[PDB]
Design a protein around this ligand. Sequence first.
Ligand SMILES: CC[C@H](C)CNC(=O)C[C@H](O)[C@H](CC(C)C)NC(=O)[C@H](CCCCNC(=S)NC)NC(=O)[C@H](Cc1ccccc1)NS(=O)(=O)N(C)C
Length: 330
Amino acid sequence: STGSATTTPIDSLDDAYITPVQIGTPAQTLNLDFDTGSSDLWVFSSETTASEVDGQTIYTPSKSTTAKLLSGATWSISYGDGSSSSGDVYTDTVSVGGLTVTGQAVESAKKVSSSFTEDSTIDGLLGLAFSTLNTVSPTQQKTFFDNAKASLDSPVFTADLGYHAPGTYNFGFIDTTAYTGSITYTAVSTKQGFWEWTSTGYAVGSGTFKSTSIDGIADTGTTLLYLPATVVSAYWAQVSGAKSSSSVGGYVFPCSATLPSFTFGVGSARIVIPGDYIDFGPISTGSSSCFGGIQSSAGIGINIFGDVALKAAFVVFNGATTPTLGFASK
Ligand SMILES: CC[C@H](C)CNC(=O)C[C@H](O)[C@H](CC(C)C)NC(=O)[C@H](CCCCNC(=S)NC)NC(=O)[C@H](Cc1ccccc1)NS(=O)(=O)N(C)C
């Protein structure tokens, strides 16, 4: 079996993408944030504290005939940006672009943090990192991909995210019409439970490729590109008006500038992010100052190949016994 779903940015700055998911019987469609950086599928529902509910679409376990409460299981998670959620768990049928998994754990939120209540276009998260990061207790619940693996035509899923446009998530197949060149595969360490890999170096604009190991994670749930502070500094050094702002939280630049591209190595291959994808957007509507999409990972503690990187390539999360990650130019 296979599945294909279109995914869309929740705003005009590509802060996140949501993909529709059908949960329960008859199907309840929710729009979730497909996150390769977590392993929890949870959604807002009939159980979340009302005043914690904005205009999100909720899951009502009670209206689904295949739902089953998972006796005694609870969950609690906190994310990298401080948000958090917790609740209980049900198992139900979950479909993604025609790809159905029965008995998938759907974690029902009882409480959500303020950033989630305020983001009206995200109904929950669908985690895609290793099941070892799952927060359900006492027994960890497998991700949608671990559960679909038996059925998949090939154990893989690809991310094809768009720059200010829709994209696609596909499961169990590789669409050769979607990228150019061939796919370069790189080893993944699962020690931390993440889609963790090592980049071979970088290049700023039309300058030299520097061979330096960049250990990082590929995470569709992270907006920007977090690199070591000395690589970020070499990028911004090429942009005349750019500077580091303590008030805004990072490098800012005149919106007016044409920024250089940024290339990161994948083995022998190079993936070129267009200077424009690095222009995240102005600080505030009308400002002459814009937010840089390449930020320092000094304060996070790990490098993150988030959305600004991920959208410049065709990405293959190959979930075979020995997982690997493939990158293609598109
Ligand atoms: C078991 C716990 C596991 C390890 C949790 N994994 C994780 O926590 C990684 C996972 O991908 C989350 C998903 C996110 C939707 C809440 N990413 C994040 O938490 C990041 C943080 C990236 C690193 C930032 N950390 C720091 S200290 N920066 C100074 N958020 C993001 O990148 C959000 C994503 C987002 C956007 C819009 C709506 C919802 C969520 N964009 S952002 O807020 O940082 N951007 C607006 C500035």
